[PDB]
Design an enzyme around this catalytic site. Structure first.
Site, PDB file in Angstrom:
ATOM      1  N   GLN A   1     -14.237  -0.748   8.927  1.00  0.00           N
ATOM      2  CA  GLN A   1     -13.323  -1.054   7.797  1.00  0.00           C
ATOM      3  C   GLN A   1     -13.499  -2.473   7.253  1.00  0.00           C
ATOM      4  O   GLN A   1     -13.712  -2.656   6.049  1.00  0.00           O
ATOM      5  CB  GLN A   1     -11.853  -0.642   8.100  1.00  0.00           C
TER       6      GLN A   1
ATOM      7  N   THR B   1      -8.817   5.173   1.885  1.00  0.00           N
ATOM      8  CA  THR B   1      -9.332   5.767   0.623  1.00  0.00           C
ATOM      9  C   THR B   1     -10.871   5.901   0.731  1.00  0.00           C
ATOM     10  O   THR B   1     -11.552   4.857   0.787  1.00  0.00           O
ATOM     11  CB  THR B   1      -8.992   4.913  -0.611  1.00  0.00           C
TER      12      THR B   1
ATOM     13  N   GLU C   1      -8.439  -4.224   3.005  1.00  0.00           N
ATOM     14  CA  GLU C   1      -7.890  -3.278   2.023  1.00  0.00           C
ATOM     15  C   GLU C   1      -8.788  -3.151   0.809  1.00  0.00           C
ATOM     16  O   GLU C   1      -9.190  -2.028   0.470  1.00  0.00           O
ATOM     17  CB  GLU C   1      -6.509  -3.709   1.573  1.00  0.00           C
ATOM     18  N   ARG C   2      -9.115  -4.267   0.182  1.00  0.00           N
ATOM     19  CA  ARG C   2     -10.084  -4.323  -0.932  1.00  0.00           C
ATOM     20  C   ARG C   2      -9.794  -3.355  -2.113  1.00  0.00           C
ATOM     21  O   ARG C   2     -10.687  -2.615  -2.547  1.00  0.00           O
ATOM     22  CB  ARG C   2     -11.502  -4.086  -0.394  1.00  0.00           C
ATOM     23  N   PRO C   3      -8.562  -3.375  -2.647  1.00  0.00           N
ATOM     24  CA  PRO C   3      -8.231  -2.526  -3.791  1.00  0.00           C
ATOM     25  C   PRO C   3      -8.823  -3.064  -5.116  1.00  0.00           C
ATOM     26  O   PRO C   3      -9.429  -4.137  -5.137  1.00  0.00           O
ATOM     27  CB  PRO C   3      -6.699  -2.606  -3.828  1.00  0.00           C
TER      28      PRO C   3
ATOM     29  N   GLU D   1       0.803  -1.210   0.000  1.00  0.00           N
ATOM     30  CA  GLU D   1       0.000   0.000   0.000  1.00  0.00           C
ATOM     31  C   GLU D   1       0.846   1.275   0.000  1.00  0.00           C
ATOM     32  O   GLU D   1       0.512   2.247  -0.677  1.00  0.00           O
ATOM     33  CB  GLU D   1      -0.962  -0.014   1.200  1.00  0.00           C
TER      34      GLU D   1
HETATM   35  C1  LIG Z   1      -7.682   2.517  -7.718  1.00  0.00           C
HETATM   36  C2  LIG Z   1      -7.559   1.699  -6.460  1.00  0.00           C
HETATM   37  O1  LIG Z   1      -7.477   0.463  -6.469  1.00  0.00           O
HETATM   38  N1  LIG Z   1      -7.525   2.401  -5.341  1.00  0.00           N
HETATM   39  C3  LIG Z   1      -7.282   1.662  -4.117  1.00  0.00           C
HETATM   40  C4  LIG Z   1      -8.518   1.695  -3.228  1.00  0.00           C
HETATM   41  O2  LIG Z   1      -9.622   1.073  -3.864  1.00  0.00           O
HETATM   42  C5  LIG Z   1      -8.253   0.946  -1.920  1.00  0.00           C
HETATM   43  O3  LIG Z   1      -9.155   1.440  -0.963  1.00  0.00           O
HETATM   44  C6  LIG Z   1     -10.331   0.644  -0.776  1.00  0.00           C
HETATM   45  O4  LIG Z   1     -11.319   0.977  -1.752  1.00  0.00           O
HETATM   46  C7  LIG Z   1     -12.455   0.132  -1.657  1.00  0.00           C
HETATM   47  C8  LIG Z   1     -13.385   0.410  -2.845  1.00  0.00           C
HETATM   48  O5  LIG Z   1     -13.750   1.774  -2.824  1.00  0.00           O
HETATM   49  C9  LIG Z   1     -13.147   0.332  -0.299  1.00  0.00           C
HETATM   50  O6  LIG Z   1     -14.173  -0.642  -0.129  1.00  0.00           O
HETATM   51  C10 LIG Z   1     -15.506  -0.083  -0.129  1.00  0.00           C
HETATM   52  O7  LIG Z   1     -15.794   0.442   1.142  1.00  0.00           O
HETATM   53  C11 LIG Z   1     -17.102   0.957   1.324  1.00  0.00           C
HETATM   54  C12 LIG Z   1     -17.172   1.369   2.783  1.00  0.00           C
HETATM   55  O8  LIG Z   1     -16.887   2.739   2.823  1.00  0.00           O
HETATM   56  C13 LIG Z   1     -18.196  -0.070   1.036  1.00  0.00           C
HETATM   57  O9  LIG Z   1     -19.431   0.619   0.943  1.00  0.00           O
HETATM   58  C14 LIG Z   1     -17.965  -0.855  -0.248  1.00  0.00           C
HETATM   59  O10 LIG Z   1     -18.772  -2.017  -0.185  1.00  0.00           O
HETATM   60  C15 LIG Z   1     -16.487  -1.231  -0.419  1.00  0.00           C
HETATM   61  N2  LIG Z   1     -16.219  -1.729  -1.744  1.00  0.00           N
HETATM   62  C16 LIG Z   1     -15.590  -2.882  -1.948  1.00  0.00           C
HETATM   63  C17 LIG Z   1     -15.452  -3.262  -3.390  1.00  0.00           C
HETATM   64  O11 LIG Z   1     -15.138  -3.609  -1.055  1.00  0.00           O
HETATM   65  C18 LIG Z   1     -12.171   0.147   0.867  1.00  0.00           C
HETATM   66  O12 LIG Z   1     -12.720   0.622   2.091  1.00  0.00           O
HETATM   67  C19 LIG Z   1     -10.870   0.906   0.626  1.00  0.00           C
HETATM   68  N3  LIG Z   1      -9.854   0.512   1.616  1.00  0.00           N
HETATM   69  C20 LIG Z   1      -9.414   1.336   2.551  1.00  0.00           C
HETATM   70  C21 LIG Z   1      -8.303   0.769   3.398  1.00  0.00           C
HETATM   71  O13 LIG Z   1      -9.809   2.497   2.715  1.00  0.00           O
HETATM   72  C22 LIG Z   1      -6.886   1.302  -1.325  1.00  0.00           C
HETATM   73  C23 LIG Z   1      -6.455   0.293  -0.265  1.00  0.00           C
HETATM   74  O14 LIG Z   1      -6.305  -1.001  -0.782  1.00  0.00           O
HETATM   75  O15 LIG Z   1      -5.847   1.360  -2.300  1.00  0.00           O
HETATM   76  C24 LIG Z   1      -6.113   2.262  -3.355  1.00  0.00           C
HETATM   77  O16 LIG Z   1      -4.971   2.286  -4.177  1.00  0.00           O
END
Ligand SMILES: CC(=O)N[C@@H]1[C@@H](O)[C@H](O[C@@H]2O[C@H](CO)[C@@H](O[C@@H]3O[C@H](CO)[C@@H](O)[C@H](O)[C@H]3NC(C)=O)[C@H](O)[C@H]2NC(C)=O)[C@@H](CO)O[C@H]1O
EC number: 3.2.1.-
Length: 159
Positions: free
Chosen positions: A106, A71, A137-139, A45
């Site tokens: 989270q 994010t 993390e869920r990227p 990350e």
């Molecule tokens: C371009 C890219 O990959 N950016 C990366 C970020 O996506 C990633 O942050 C995580 O993003 C996901 C998707 O937006 C977040 O999950 C979502 O969270 C919300 C809750 O607020 C929920 O409603 C959704 O269901 C859920 N979506 C999914 C698909 O799970 C997640 O919270 C973010 N993670 C964090 C730690 O904030 C980050 C980290 O891996 O990296 C960026 O590069």
């Protein structure tokens, strides 16, 4: 002694930060395996850098920031500011993570492991790395098996 900057850390620098995190979280009830699983993620990350903005884009609070790339960064920065903690700070970011485990934030339970189970787990650093990737993390790209290699690397190379 920790490195906090908007710059990618070398392996030597990451190692300083990673040992610090392991000591801190061990005092708060986490296993070494769970910590290293998370470290394996933090390396991908942010190169385990509390100061790091996504793309090195400083000041863009809609994008990722910090150890785990919260994010939007505002998800963390808003909390730190509201809590009277300095946002660009190792301990402040570790306090957020502790806050998340305590308040079930989270984490989404995609792998039949809760955040509270995770931190007590003695599964391998590789397995826990993959669980933390999927649950916390869920990227946009879910295929980052190097996070597990990295977790094992820290498990081997830290105390
Ligand atoms: C371009 C890219 O990959 N950016 C990366 C970020 O996506 C990633 O942050 C995580 O993003 C996901 C998707 O937006 C977040 O999950 C979502 O969270 C919300 C809750 O607020 C929920 O409603 C959704 O269901 C859920 N979506 C999914 C698909 O799970 C997640 O919270 C973010 N993670 C964090 C730690 O904030 C980050 C980290 O891996 O990296 C960026 O590069």
């Amino acid at each position: 002694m920790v490195y906090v900057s908007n710059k990618y850390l070398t392996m030597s620098e990451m190692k300083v930060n990673a040992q610090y995190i392991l000591n801190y979280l061990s005092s708060n009830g986490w296993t070494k395996q769970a910590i290293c699983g998370m470290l394996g993620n933090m390396q991908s990350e942010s190169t385990i850098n509390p100061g790091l903005w996504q793309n090195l884009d400083e000041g863009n609070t809609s994008l990722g920031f910090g150890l785990v790339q919260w994010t939007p960064a505002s998800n963390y920065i808003n909390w730190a500011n509201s809590q009277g903690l300095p946002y660009k700070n190792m301990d402040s970011e570790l306090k957020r993570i502790i806050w998340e485990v305590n308040n079930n934030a989270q984490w989404i339970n995609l792998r039949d492991m809760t955040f509270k189970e995770y931190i007590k787990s003695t599964k391998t650093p590789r397995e826990l790395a993959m669980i933390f990737l999927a649950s916390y993390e869920r990227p946009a790209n879910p295929n980052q098996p190097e996070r597990g290699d990295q977790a094992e690397y820290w498990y081997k190379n830290l105390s």
